Design a protein around this motif. Structure first.
Motif, PDB file in Angstrom:
ATOM      1  N   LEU A 159     -10.949   4.202   5.699  1.00  0.00           N
ATOM      2  CA  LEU A 159     -10.129   5.363   5.954  1.00  0.00           C
ATOM      3  C   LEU A 159      -9.056   5.133   7.007  1.00  0.00           C
ATOM      4  N   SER A 160      -7.890   5.739   6.795  1.00  0.00           N
ATOM      5  CA  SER A 160      -6.758   5.586   7.697  1.00  0.00           C
ATOM      6  C   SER A 160      -6.405   6.885   8.373  1.00  0.00           C
ATOM      7  N   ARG A 161      -6.020   6.763   9.636  1.00  0.00           N
ATOM      8  CA  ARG A 161      -5.660   7.961  10.391  1.00  0.00           C
ATOM      9  C   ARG A 161      -4.361   8.579   9.870  1.00  0.00           C
ATOM     10  N   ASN A 162      -3.439   7.775   9.298  1.00  0.00           N
ATOM     11  CA  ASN A 162      -2.171   8.339   8.793  1.00  0.00           C
ATOM     12  C   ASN A 162      -1.861   7.525   7.530  1.00  0.00           C
ATOM     13  N   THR A 163      -0.935   8.012   6.714  1.00  0.00           N
ATOM     14  CA  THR A 163      -0.374   7.252   5.562  1.00  0.00           C
ATOM     15  C   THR A 163       0.548   6.099   5.960  1.00  0.00           C
ATOM     16  N   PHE A 164       0.656   5.094   5.077  1.00  0.00           N
ATOM     17  CA  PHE A 164       1.586   3.990   5.224  1.00  0.00           C
ATOM     18  C   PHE A 164       2.666   4.119   4.187  1.00  0.00           C
ATOM     19  N   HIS A 165       3.843   3.587   4.596  1.00  0.00           N
ATOM     20  CA  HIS A 165       5.053   3.705   3.785  1.00  0.00           C
ATOM     21  C   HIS A 165       5.540   2.338   3.351  1.00  0.00           C
ATOM     22  N   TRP A 166       5.686   2.227   2.031  1.00  0.00           N
ATOM     23  CA  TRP A 166       5.937   0.914   1.416  1.00  0.00           C
ATOM     24  C   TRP A 166       7.233   0.912   0.634  1.00  0.00           C
ATOM     25  N   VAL A 167       7.858  -0.250   0.623  1.00  0.00           N
ATOM     26  CA  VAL A 167       8.819  -0.572  -0.433  1.00  0.00           C
ATOM     27  C   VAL A 167       8.205  -1.660  -1.298  1.00  0.00           C
ATOM     28  N   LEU A 168       8.157  -1.406  -2.615  1.00  0.00           N
ATOM     29  CA  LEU A 168       7.609  -2.372  -3.507  1.00  0.00           C
ATOM     30  C   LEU A 168       8.694  -2.946  -4.420  1.00  0.00           C
ATOM     31  N   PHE A 259       6.576  -4.415   1.033  1.00  0.00           N
ATOM     32  CA  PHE A 259       7.190  -4.328   2.349  1.00  0.00           C
ATOM     33  C   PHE A 259       6.708  -3.107   3.100  1.00  0.00           C
ATOM     34  N   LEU A 260       6.077  -3.339   4.258  1.00  0.00           N
ATOM     35  CA  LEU A 260       5.553  -2.211   5.046  1.00  0.00           C
ATOM     36  C   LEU A 260       6.645  -1.715   5.978  1.00  0.00           C
ATOM     37  N   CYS A 261       6.938  -0.440   5.891  1.00  0.00           N
ATOM     38  CA  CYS A 261       8.013   0.227   6.722  1.00  0.00           C
ATOM     39  C   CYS A 261       7.427   1.152   7.772  1.00  0.00           C
ATOM     40  N   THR A 262       8.247   1.569   8.720  1.00  0.00           N
ATOM     41  CA  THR A 262       7.723   2.398   9.786  1.00  0.00           C
ATOM     42  C   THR A 262       7.561   3.819   9.417  1.00  0.00           C
ATOM     43  N   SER A 263       8.271   4.305   8.384  1.00  0.00           N
ATOM     44  CA  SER A 263       8.303   5.737   8.055  1.00  0.00           C
ATOM     45  C   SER A 263       8.868   5.948   6.648  1.00  0.00           C
ATOM     46  N   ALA A 264       8.794   7.188   6.164  1.00  0.00           N
ATOM     47  CA  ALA A 264       9.307   7.484   4.831  1.00  0.00           C
ATOM     48  C   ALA A 264      10.802   7.308   4.859  1.00  0.00           C
ATOM     49  N   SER A 265      11.440   7.816   5.921  1.00  0.00           N
ATOM     50  CA  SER A 265      12.889   7.566   6.054  1.00  0.00           C
ATOM     51  C   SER A 265      13.291   6.094   6.034  1.00  0.00           C
ATOM     52  N   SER A 266      12.585   5.267   6.771  1.00  0.00           N
ATOM     53  CA  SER A 266      12.877   3.893   6.845  1.00  0.00           C
ATOM     54  C   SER A 266      12.699   3.274   5.450  1.00  0.00           C
ATOM     55  N   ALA A 267      11.636   3.671   4.728  1.00  0.00           N
ATOM     56  CA  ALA A 267      11.390   3.024   3.431  1.00  0.00           C
ATOM     57  C   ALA A 267      12.512   3.378   2.478  1.00  0.00           C
ATOM     58  N   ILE A 268      12.996   4.623   2.581  1.00  0.00           N
ATOM     59  CA  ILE A 268      14.129   4.995   1.702  1.00  0.00           C
ATOM     60  C   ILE A 268      15.309   4.087   1.971  1.00  0.00           C
ATOM     61  N   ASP A 269      15.535   3.797   3.243  1.00  0.00           N
ATOM     62  CA  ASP A 269      16.757   3.041   3.627  1.00  0.00           C
ATOM     63  C   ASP A 269      16.570   1.599   3.254  1.00  0.00           C
ATOM     64  N   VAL A 270      15.363   1.096   3.546  1.00  0.00           N
ATOM     65  CA  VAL A 270      15.046  -0.321   3.162  1.00  0.00           C
ATOM     66  C   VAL A 270      15.160  -0.487   1.640  1.00  0.00           C
ATOM     67  N   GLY A 271      14.632   0.466   0.860  1.00  0.00           N
ATOM     68  CA  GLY A 271      14.658   0.478  -0.596  1.00  0.00           C
ATOM     69  C   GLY A 271      16.110   0.499  -1.113  1.00  0.00           C
ATOM     70  N   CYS A 280      15.938  -8.374  -6.560  1.00  0.00           N
ATOM     71  CA  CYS A 280      14.817  -7.958  -7.449  1.00  0.00           C
ATOM     72  C   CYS A 280      15.222  -7.190  -8.736  1.00  0.00           C
ATOM     73  N   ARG A 281      14.383  -7.183  -9.776  1.00  0.00           N
ATOM     74  CA  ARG A 281      14.663  -6.391 -10.969  1.00  0.00           C
ATOM     75  C   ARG A 281      14.499  -4.904 -10.658  1.00  0.00           C
ATOM     76  N   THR A 282      13.459  -4.558  -9.922  1.00  0.00           N
ATOM     77  CA  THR A 282      13.098  -3.118  -9.785  1.00  0.00           C
ATOM     78  C   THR A 282      12.661  -2.916  -8.333  1.00  0.00           C
ATOM     79  N   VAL A 283      13.080  -1.816  -7.705  1.00  0.00           N
ATOM     80  CA  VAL A 283      12.707  -1.523  -6.278  1.00  0.00           C
ATOM     81  C   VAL A 283      12.189  -0.073  -6.248  1.00  0.00           C
ATOM     82  N   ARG A 284      11.037   0.127  -5.588  1.00  0.00           N
ATOM     83  CA  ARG A 284      10.436   1.451  -5.627  1.00  0.00           C
ATOM     84  C   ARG A 284       9.840   1.760  -4.255  1.00  0.00           C
ATOM     85  N   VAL A 285       9.879   3.051  -3.909  1.00  0.00           N
ATOM     86  CA  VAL A 285       9.174   3.454  -2.653  1.00  0.00           C
ATOM     87  C   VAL A 285       7.815   4.000  -3.034  1.00  0.00           C
TER      88      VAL A 285
END
Ligand code: ANP
Length: 296
Positions: A159-168, A259-271, A280-285
């Motif tokens: 179990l995790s105390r908070n969610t993690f934000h990814w770019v795949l 790719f592990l990001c610091t936040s939902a905002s960051s993942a959007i920007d990284v994505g 890459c062929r396909t990029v998803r948050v």
């Protein structure tokens, strides 16, 4: 009719035992379910049928070569019944993207049939069927995050105390798991590729919900071997980090780079940066953990 939502997975940690025989590697993995999902809808029917819709779905078999079909056959045989159901899969787990989408669909079929036929066989019986079906089906039932130690044994919930934000990010071509294990074996003969930390630190970072702590602990012993065969993966992992990700790893034998990001905002920007840059062929948050196969 019953619809079940089931997630794809990423491996946060994968240690691969030295080859023994007949050429086996013992795997210790931290599995993490993330919010790229399929939705599987099962209804009663005259005969078993299966259809899939979504990007890449046209590449997939609709007969017994499909694990979801095998799942329906196994679940019905288990309760002495014929598998007289129609199965429709709304696929959004990228196809051939290394996130075990056929295994997620099989897990969802078990859960959808259990509910549709009002049987309510216990979860232990579903895990048993899932193991027969194939090595990633159990985790699709389980969901969340889990540590897996080897072939039979129960997964352990983390179990995790908070969610993690990814770019795949998904490369335009996957590698055969076979070939990657070979190049891993060879790199170890010829040299000393990266050997991972223990997985306890990874579980402590996940428990803490702390992506800065998790980031340098992500790892995959198959990565060196992937990167050896496709060096482009090396620039892709660097690009994601240059884009603002904390860390990036290849998941499994690929083609997912995670790719592990610091936040939902960051993942959007990284994505955005990664999609623009065409490595890459396909990029998803995505976010993780998310639950395993459940009726929706
Ligand atoms: N509903 C499905 N059932 C069983 N196999 C599938 C299904 N969809 C795709 N596949 C097969 O598995 C490969 C495509 O991968 P998919 O299942 O889309 O995630 P994945 O790439 O398999 N991840 P992994 O299980 O980690 O290897 C192809 O060889 C497909 O034929």
């Amino acid at each position: 009719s019953v619809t079940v939502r089931v997630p794809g997975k990423v491996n946060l940690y994968l240690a691969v035992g030295d080859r023994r025989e007949d050429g086996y590697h013992e795997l210790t993995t931290v599995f993490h379910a993330v919010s790229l999902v399929d939705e599987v809808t099962v209804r009663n029917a005259d005969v078993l049928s299966l259809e899939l819709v979504g990007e890449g779905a046209d590449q997939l078999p609709t007969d017994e070569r499909n694990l979801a079909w095998q799942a329906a056959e196994l679940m019905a045989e288990h309760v002495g019944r014929a598998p007289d159901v129609s199965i429709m899969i709304d696929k959004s787990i990228p196809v051939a993207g290394g996130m075990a989408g056929g295994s997620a669909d099989a897990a969802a079929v078990l859960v959808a049939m259990n509910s549709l036929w009002e049987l309510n066989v216990p979860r232990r019986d579903l895990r048993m069927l899932a193991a027969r079906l194939g090595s990633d089906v159990p985790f699709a039932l389980h969901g969340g995050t889990a540590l897996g130690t080897g072939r039979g044994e129960e997964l352990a919930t983390v179990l995790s105390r908070n969610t993690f934000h990814w770019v795949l990010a998904f490369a335009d071509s996957g590698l055969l798991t076979s070939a990657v294990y070979n190049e891993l074996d060879r790199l170890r003969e010829v040299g000393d590729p990266p050997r991972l930390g223990e997985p306890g630190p990874v579980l402590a970072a996940l428990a803490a919900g702390d992506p800065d702590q998790l980031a340098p602990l992500l790892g995959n012993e198959m990565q060196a071997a992937a990167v050896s065969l496709d060096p482009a993966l090396a620039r892709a992992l660097r690009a994601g980090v240059e884009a603002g990700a904390l860390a990036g790893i290849v998941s499994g034998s690929g083609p997912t780079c995670a790719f592990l990001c610091t936040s939902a905002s960051s993942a959007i920007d990284v994505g955005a940066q990664l999609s623009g840059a065409g490595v890459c062929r396909t990029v998803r948050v995505a976010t993780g953990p998310v639950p395993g196969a459940r009726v929706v």
